Amino acid sequence: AMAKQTIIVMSDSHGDSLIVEEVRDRYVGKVDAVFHNGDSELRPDSPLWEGIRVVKGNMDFYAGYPERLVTELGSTKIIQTHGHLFDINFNFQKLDYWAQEEEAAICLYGHLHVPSAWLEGKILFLNPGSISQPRGTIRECLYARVEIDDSYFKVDFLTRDHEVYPGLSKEFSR
Ligand SMILES: [Cl-]
Ligand SMILES: [Cl-]
Ligand SMILES: [Mn+2]
Ligand SMILES: [Mn+2]
């Protein structure tokens, strides 16, 4: 039985560097990985990115962010993209095709500023929400925690004070 993993995922921070630093500082070295799914509006050479896996958003104009990132975490293959290059506002068919060709455990995306967690195929798709500019029905700034083991993905959405926001948590069996 694999040892349990915990990942921290955020996105669409939009020029708020204190929140990125705060989340880095809180979690780097205490969880298995920390992810940012883009639209930070920060420089890729920022020291705030030490310990964090970050991809390019459409509102990231500086050279040096990757469009896609594959992170293999033990037996867990995580893929990560902003989403704009997959036309996710149209639908998720292009994103899901890529996730299937990669045979990902987890597919991380941003762009929509809407928190979501669903299982399609055996693949968890997660948008952590926007940590600065929430959209849709939930007007609270959010990021996400995923707990991973052989039996379950557990997803909680967390506020900027690092508390679980109720009514959004999901548990998926694998
Ligand atoms: Cl799009
Ligand atoms: Cl946008
Ligand atoms: Mn954005
Ligand atoms: Mn975007």
Q: What is the DSSP string of 52-91?
A: EEE---TT--STT--SEEEEEETTEEEEEE-SGGGTTTT-
Residue at token pair 């050279």: 63
- For residue 44, the one-letter residue type is P
Rg (CA), the chain: 15
Ligand 2 centroid to residue 58 C-alpha, Å: 6
Ligand 3 centroid to residue 162 C-alpha, Å: 21
Neighbour-count burial of 56, counting CB atoms closer than 10 A to its CB (0-12 exposed, 13-18 middle, 19+ buried): buried
- For residue 6, the one-letter residue type is T
Sheet holding 5-10, edge to edge: 52-54, 33-36, 5-10, 143-148, 152-158, 170-173
- For residue 122, the one-letter residue type is K
Q: Please give the Cα distance from 68 to 35 (Å, whole number).
A: 12
Residues 113 and 143 sit within 8 Å (Cβ to Cβ) = no
In units of Å, what resolution does this entry have?
Answer: 2.3
Residues with CB under 5 A from ligand 3 (ion): 12, 39
Experimental method: X-ray
* Token pair recorded at residue 142: 């959010």
With H, G, I as helix, E, B as strand and everything else as coil, classify residue 166. coil
**Domains of the chain, earliest start first:** 1-174 (3.60.21.10)
Which ligand has the shortest distance to the CA of 135? 3
